[PDB]
Design a protein around this ligand. Structure first.
Ligand SMILES: Nc1ncnc2c1ncn2[C@@H]1O[C@H](COP(=O)(O)OP(=O)(O)O)[C@@H](O)[C@H]1O
Ligand SMILES: Nc1ncnc2c1ncn2[C@@H]1O[C@H](COP(=O)(O)OP(=O)(O)O)[C@@H](O)[C@H]1O
Ligand SMILES: Nc1ncnc2c1ncn2[C@@H]1O[C@H](COP(=O)(O)OP(=O)(O)O)[C@@H](O)[C@H]1O
Ligand SMILES: Nc1ncnc2c1ncn2[C@@H]1O[C@H](COP(=O)(O)OP(=O)(O)O)[C@@H](O)[C@H]1O
Ligand SMILES: Nc1ncnc2c1ncn2[C@@H]1O[C@H](COP(=O)(O)OP(=O)(O)O)[C@@H](O)[C@H]1O
Ligand SMILES: Nc1ncnc2c1ncn2[C@@H]1O[C@H](COP(=O)(O)OP(=O)(O)O)[C@@H](O)[C@H]1O
Ligand SMILES: [Mg+2]
Ligand SMILES: [Mg+2]
Ligand SMILES: [Mg+2]
Ligand SMILES: [Mg+2]
Ligand SMILES: [Mg+2]
Ligand SMILES: [Mg+2]
Lengths: 288, 288, 288, 288, 288, 288
C-alpha cells in the first residue's frame, strides 16, 4: 500500500531498515514470516506467480495450488482494497506476489538471511553472472550450502540439457513458488531459458521482491549465452536492476565480487569471495 | 475542451498562468481542487486511469473504485459532451484522466505546489533521473519531505527487489490514483518497471497532466537500468517530455539540477540543489 | 471521386487552383464551405475521423456525434457510390474524412485562409517544428491570433504535463473535429503524443486534407522529443509530407521559415518570420 | 493458368509478345479487352482488389461493386478450376486480379498503350519517382495528357494534404478499380500513403499485372518522403520491381529517364524526356 | 519416417543414392513415381501444400482439389501412423508434402531428371539467381526447354507486372501443385512475390523436397529486388539452402554457374553454362 | 522436482553424477530407462513434446500417440503434484518432457551413451556445426554408426530439398519422439528448418534434457545457412547452450573438435576427431 511520512517517521523507517540488514539476527525475518504464514486461515491464497502466458497461478501456505476460491476483499489501513479470486486454476482477481501481508509498515528492507565468512548476506534475489562459461553452477551450490548453514538449501533445476532437468516454464514457477514458501535458501540453476515470454518477464520483475518480503534469498545462475562481448555488460546491468545482490566473476580465477543492496536508499556494499575446487568439482568458498 | 482566444483574452490567460506559478500562495491550487472534489455528488466518477491491458479503472472522490455506473452525459460550454459509464469494474465510456472539471478556463498551468529554500516548485510530475546508480531514492524522499512542509508526503513503492514492494502494475496505478486523490506531495519510488505495456505507456502520458490539474506533484525516481552510455540522454529526453519538472544528477557529488516548466509557453527555470547524507542514509537538501 | 481531363480542362483546373490561393479573398473558401455545411439536411453525417483503435466516429454539421444512422447511399457524377452507416457510435460504412462534398470539381487547392504581414497563408495543416525545445508553443499562438485576424482562434490542447490538458487520444480527435467544423483558425498544442496507434496514424494522414477541404488551417506544434540529432531531419521530413505548410525554427533567435504548398503541382513558396517576446511570454510576429 | 511449351511454341510466344509492344497498333489491346469485358454476362464478377484489411472487394464490368454472388466454378484448359463467391461485400472465394480471362494464351506482354514523341509506351504500371521533392505531380499529368492522346486521362487522387483529396485506402482502391475498368490512361497522384497495410502491399503487387492485362497504364507518383539519402535507391529498386515502366528524375532540370520493360524476357528500353513549365505550372513534354 | 542403419545398410544406401543421380536413366525416377501415383486409389489425397494463411489445400492424382475427405490413418513400417483428413477444402489432419509414399527406403536422392550438353541435372528445386536485373527469365526458359528434351516444359507465372500474370499466392500454389503432379520439367517465373507469409515460407521449405521425391525439377527465377549490394550474397545463401541445385550469374556475359547437390551427404558438383540470344530474346544454351 | 542438500548429500550427488559419465558401463543408463518405460502401466502417457503451434502431443511407451486421457494426478516426494490430461490429441494438462520419472534423485547427469576410439560420449543432444557448407551430414552418420556400436542408429530426416525428406515440423517431432522412445543412438539430419515457431523453440529447449534423461543421444546437424561471417559464432553459441555436447569443424580438413559437458557443474572435456572419405562419400572416423 502507500505510506505517509514526515521527517521523524522517515528517520525511524530508515533506522529500522538499517537494523533489518545490519543488526537483526540472521534468518530472523524468515522465521517471522514463516510464523505469519502458518497463522493464515486454512485455504487462504498466500502467493500468486505468473505462468508463461502472463496469467497467474495461486498457492496456499502449504505450497498447494488453489484452483477455486470465491472472491474475497480486504480493506487495508491505507484505505485500499485487496481482492483475490481464483477460478479454473487461475487468478481471476488479485495481483502477482504475496497475497497476505508479510511486512506491514516495515518495507524496503533486505532482511539478513545469513552470515558466513564474516559477512552478512541479504535475503531477496541474488544473480550469479559474469564472464561467460565459467563456474557459475559450482558457485551457486557452494553459496547455497554456506548460506543454508545448519539447514539444507533447496535446488530448483531448469533449462539445461542434462538429465532430470525440467524445461517447461510452468513447472519452473511451480518449483520456485514451493521453494520460497518452504525454504530460507534457494538455488535456481539457470535463469537461462527465462531471459521473452510474459511469465518470464513477470518472474524477473517479481522474484526479488517476493524473496525479500519472505526473507528467503534465491541464488540464481545466469550464464550469458549471448556473445562473450560487452553484451555481458547489459546482462550484468539487467541483473543489477532486478537483483537484491549481484555476484560477478572477475579476471582472477575462483574469485567473485559480491555487491549487496542493504535496503531502500541504503548503502550498497561489496566484498570479495575466494573459492577452490575439490573432488568431483565440489566448490569451497574460503572463509578465514 | 477547446478554448477560443483573441489577443486580449490570450494575454489575460498568460497573466493568469504566470500568476498560478509565480504569485499564488503555494499549495493553494491543491486546496482549491480538494474543494472541488468534495463538492462532487456522492458516487460520481472523478478519476480514470489505465491498467496494464490499456483498459481503465475508475475512482470516486474518496479514492474508492467504482465498478458499476450507468451511462451519464454532460454538456460542456464548448458544446462538447462528456460521457462516463462503468461496467464490471472498467470504464465502458469516458476518458483517462480527471472526469470532473478541476480547471475550467484556467488551463496550461504548473500551479505552485510548495516553496522551499527560496524556490517555488511546480505541481505536476517531477522525474528524478540521470547518471545511473546514484542516490535517486534518497533524493526523492528528501524532496518529498521538504515539499510536504507541514504535511506528510505519500510514498508509492513499485518494482524494486526489496521487502514489501508491490511489482504488479495494476496495484501500482491503484496506489497512484489514491495518492493523487488524497495528498499534495507524492513520491513514486521507481518508474523502473514502467518504462512497454499500454497501461505503462498511458501512465507516462497521463500522470503529469493529472497531477498538474490537481495541483499535487508526483516525485518519481527513474534509474536508467539501461547502459550507462548516452542512452541516459534518451532517458532524460523522454523524461523532459513527460515531466512538468526534471531533476538530474550532475558530475558534482550530492548536486542536482532542477529544471522547471512554469506553465504553457512560459519560461523554463533552473536552479541547483546541494545535498548531504546523515545517519542511515537520510539525505538533507541544503537551504540557506 | 476520379476526374477526367484533356489539355484544355486541365489548364482551367490549374488556373482555378492558382486563383484559390493567390486571388480569392482570404477566408472566402471557409465561408463557402460553412454555407455548404449549414445547407446539409439535419442529422446528416458530415465528418468521420479515426479514434485510437482505427475505427471512426461520426459528426453532424453542429459537431454533435452521431451514434445511429441507417445505411444511406449516394451516386456521384463519377458513377461511384458513397455509403454511410453509423451504429453503436461507430461508422459501420463510409470513409474517414468529409462525408458531404465541400469541393466538387475544385480539388487540389490550398484555399487562402488569411493574409497577414504581406503574405497569404494557406488553409490545411501547418506543422510548426524544428530545432528542439524552442518556442513552438508561443509561435503557434501568435500565428493563431494573427491568422484569426478579426476572429478568435480555437485552441486544442493535448498531451503535455500541464493543468487541464487532455491526454486521451479519443477526446483529442473529438476536439479536432469540433474545431474544424466550427472555426477557421485552429491551434493544436502538441502533436507529441500522436507521433504509433492506428488512430494517430490516421490523423497524420487525414488532417491536412480535411482542413484544406474546409478551408480552415490547423496550426500544430510538433516538438521533436526525439534526439536533438538529425532525427529532426526525419521529423521535418514526415512533417513536410503531411503538411500543407511547414514552419521551422532557424539558427537565428525568434526567426522562423514558412514553407507553403500553394496547390496541386503548384509552386512551393517560402518567406521568413521575425518574432519577439513581450510580457508573460506573449509572442509577437513582426510585420512592417 | 500454367502453359506448356516446346522450342517451337516458345519461339511463337516470344514473337507475339514482341509484336504486342513493337508492332500492334497503340491502344489496340485496351480496345480488345474492353470488348472482352462488355461480352461478359451481366452481373459477372470481373475484378477483385484488396482493401486495407487484406480482404478483397469485387466489381462487375460497369465498375459497380458486387456484394452477393453465389459460388460459381469454371474449368480452364489447364484443368485448373476458378471459383468466385461474394458475400457481405467481400470475396469469399476467388483471387485478387481479373476474374475473367483477358489474355488467354497471350501472356507476358507489355501491350503498347500509346505512342508519343517518337516512342511507344507500355500499358501496365508506371512509377514516376526519384530525387525527392521534385516536379513529379506536373510530370504524371503531362504524361497522362500525352498518352491519352485523343482521349481524356483519369486522375485518382490520394493521400496529399490538399483540398478534396481522399486519404482513406478503401476509397482509393475503389477509384483504381473503376479507373482501370473504364479508361486506358490513369494517373494516380501519390502512392505515398501506400508504401504497410496488407491491402497496400497487395496493391503494389497486383496493380502492374492488372493494368498490363487490361492494356491500360497507371502513371503513379511516388515521392520518397524518406530521407533524401540513398534510400531513394531502395525506393527506385522497389519501384523497378513492381513497375512495368519506371520514370526517374535526373540531375538535369526538367529531364527524366524512361525505362521500359517491353515484355517477358524481352529487352528493357530507355529514352529521355525533356520538359518545361508554362503558366500555372502546367508542364509540357517536348517532342520534336 | 525414420530409418535404421548399421555400417553395411548405410553403405548400400549411399551406393543407391549415388546411382539415383549418376547411373539411373535420366527421368526414370519421374516415370516411376508417375506409376506410383496412377496406382493410387481413386480419390486418395496425394499432395498437400500450404496457402497464404499457413493452412494447406490437398490434391488427388489428377491434380484436382479435394474439399472433403473422412479421416483415414495408415500404419508405416516405422510404426508411425499417417493420418489425412480434409474438410471445407482444407487439410484437417495430415502434413504438407506428398501424402502417399513415393520413395520408400530410397530417400536422400537427387534423382537425375535429364541430361543435356554432357551434364546430368538433378530433379528437385533449382533456383536461378545472382547479380540483379540480368537475364534470369530467358535462362529459366532455355533450361526448361533443354531439360524437357522430348517433352514440353510447364510454365508457372507469378508476381510480375506483365499481362496475364497471376499475383495471388493461392493461385500460385495451385499452379505449382498441378505442375508437379503432371510434368517432369517446370519453370516458375518469379519467386519474387514469395520471398513473408506463412504459405510463402512453407513453399520455400517444401518445394525442393516435393520435387526431388517426385523426380520432377522446378526451375525458379529469383531476381533479388533487394539492393545490388552484398544482400545478393544473403539471397544466394538462402537459395543454396533450400535448393537442390543453384544457377548463378557471373561477371562474364551470358555465363552461368551450375552448382548441384547430387544426393544426401554426396559431393556437390559444378559446371559452367555459355548462352547467347537469338531473335525476340530467345536464349540458347551452348552445348558442343 | 526440487531437491534439498547439505554438504554431505551434495558431495554424494556429485560423486554419482561423476560416475554416470566416467565409470558406469556405456549405454547402461539407456537400458535402465528402457526398463522403467516398459514397466509403465499400459496406456500411460510417458512423453510430451511441442508441435509447431506451441501445443504438445503425447506418446505412450510404444511411441503411439495418445489422443484421449482422463486427468490423472501424482504426488511426488517433493510434495509437488504432477497432472496429465490429454484431449483431442493434445495435452490439456501436464508439461513438455518425460511424464514418468526416469531419473529420481539422480539428476544433472550426462549418462555415458557409448565409448569409441578411446573416448566416452555423453547421452543428451549433440549438435554438429561450424564453418558452413562442410561435411556435417557425413559426420553425423559416421558418429551415428560408431556410437551405435553393436546396434543400428535411427535417422530422422528433415528440411532438406532431397527426395523423401519430410519438411513438416509436426511430422518431425513425431519422428523425434519415436526415435528417443526406441533407440539409443539417433541422428537428425538438419535442425535447419528449426532454428522461429514456438514448437521449434520448445524443441531446442527440451531435446537435450529429454535425451539425457533417457540416456539416448541425438546427433543433430546444424549447417549455418546464415552468413559465413561471425554469425557462426552466434550459432555455435546458441548450440553450446542447448547441447550436452558440441562437435565443430576446424580449419583442418576432416578434423573436428568434440566438446562434452560431463555433468552438472562438472568439467567440460575436449578431444579431437580425424576423419576421411571412402566410396560414395561414406565417412570413417579414425580410431587407433
Ligand atoms: N574441478 C574443476 N576445475 C576447474 N573447473 C571446473 C572444475 N569442475 C568444474 N569446472 C567448470 O565448472 C563449469 C561447469 O558448470 P556449468 O554449469 O556447465 O558452467 P557455466 O557456469 O559456464 O554455465 C564449467 O565451466 C567447468 O569447466
Ligand atoms: N550514506 C551514504 N553515503 C553515500 N552514498 C549513499 C549513502 N547512503 C546511500 N547511498 C547511495 O544511495 C543509493 C541507494 O538507493 P538506490 O535506490 O538503490 O539507488 P539508485 O538511485 O541508484 O537507484 C545507492 O547508490 C547508495 O550507494
Ligand atoms: N520571455 C521568453 N524569453 C525567451 N524564451 C521564452 C520566453 N518565454 C517562453 N520562452 C520559451 O518558450 C518555450 C515554452 O513553451 P514549450 O511548449 O514548453 O516549448 P517547446 O516549443 O520547446 O515545446 C520554452 O522553450 C521557453 O524556454
Ligand atoms: N512553374 C514552376 N517552375 C518550377 N517548379 C515548379 C513550377 N510549378 C511547380 N513546380 C514544382 O512542382 C512541385 C509541386 O508538386 P508536388 O506534388 O508538391 O511536388 P513533388 O513531386 O515533390 O511531390 C514542387 O516541387 C514545385 O516546387
Ligand atoms: N536480346 C537481348 N540481348 C541482351 N539482353 C536481353 C535480350 N533480350 C532480353 N534481354 C534481358 O533479359 C531481361 C528480361 O527479363 P526480365 O525478367 O525482366 O529480367 P530479370 O532476369 O532481370 O528479372 C532483361 O534484363 C533484358 O534487358
Ligand atoms: N568424397 C568426398 N570428398 C570431399 N567432400 C565430400 C565428399 N563427399 C561429400 N563431400 C561433402 O559433404 C557435403 C554434403 O553433405 P551436405 O549435407 O549437403 O553438406 P553440409 O554439411 O554443408 O550441409 C558437401 O559439402 C560435400 O561437398
Ligand atoms: Mg550454470
Ligand atoms: Mg531508485
Ligand atoms: Mg510545444
Ligand atoms: Mg506528387
Ligand atoms: Mg525474372
Ligand atoms: Mg547437413
Amino acid at each position: 500500500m502507500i505510506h505517509l511520512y514526515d521527517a521523524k517517521s522517515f528517520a525511524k523507517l530508515r533506522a529500522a531498515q538499517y537494523a533489518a540488514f545490519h543488526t537483526d539476527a540472521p534468518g530472523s525475518w524468515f522465521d517471522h514470516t514463516s510464523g505469519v504464514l502458518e497463522s493464515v486461515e486454512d485455504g487462504t491464497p498466500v502467493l500468486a506467480i505468473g505462468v508463461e502466458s502472463g496469467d497467474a497461478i495461486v498457492f496456499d501456505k502449504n505450497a498447494q495450488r488453489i484452483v477455486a476460491y470465491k472472491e474475497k476483499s480486504v480493506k487495508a489501513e491505507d484505505g485500499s482494497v485487496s481482492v483475490v479470486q481464483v477460478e479454473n486454476g487461475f487468478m481471476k482477481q488479485g495481483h502477482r506476489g504475496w497475497l497476505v501481508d508479510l511486512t506491514g509498515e516495515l518495507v524496503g528492507c533486505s532482511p539478513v538471511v545469513a552470515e558466513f565468512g564474516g559477512h552478512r548476506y541479504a535475503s531477496g534475489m541474488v544473480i550469479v553472472t559474469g564472464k561467460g562459461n565459467s563456474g557459475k553452477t559450482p558457485l551457486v551450490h557452494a553459496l547455497g550450502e554456506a548460506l543454508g548453514g545448519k539447514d539444507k538449501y533447496a535446488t530448483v533445476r531448469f533449462g539445461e540439457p542434462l538429465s532430470g532437468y525440467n524445461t517447461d516454464f510452468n513447472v519452473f514457477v511451480d518449483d520456485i513458488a514451493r521453494a520460497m514458501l518452504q525454504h530460507r535458501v534457494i538455488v535456481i540453476d539457470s535463469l537461462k531459458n527465462v531471459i521473452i515470454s510474459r511469465g518470464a518477464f513477470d518472474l524477473l520483475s517479481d522474484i526479488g521482491a517476493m524473496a525479500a518480503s519472505r526473507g528467503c534469498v534465491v541464488i540464481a545462475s545466469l550464464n550469458p549465452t549471448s556473445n562473450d562481448d560487452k553484451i555481458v555488460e547489459l546482462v550484468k546491468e539487467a541483473s543489477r536492476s532486478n537483483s537484491t545482490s549481484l555476484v560477478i566473476s572477475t579476471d582472477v580465477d575462483g574469485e567473485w565480487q559480491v555487491l549487496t543492496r542493504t535496503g531502500e536508499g541504503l548503502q550498497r556494499l561489496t566484498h570479495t569471495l575466494q573459492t577452490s575446487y575439490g573432488e568431483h568439482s565440489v566448490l569451497t568458498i574460503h572463509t578465514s
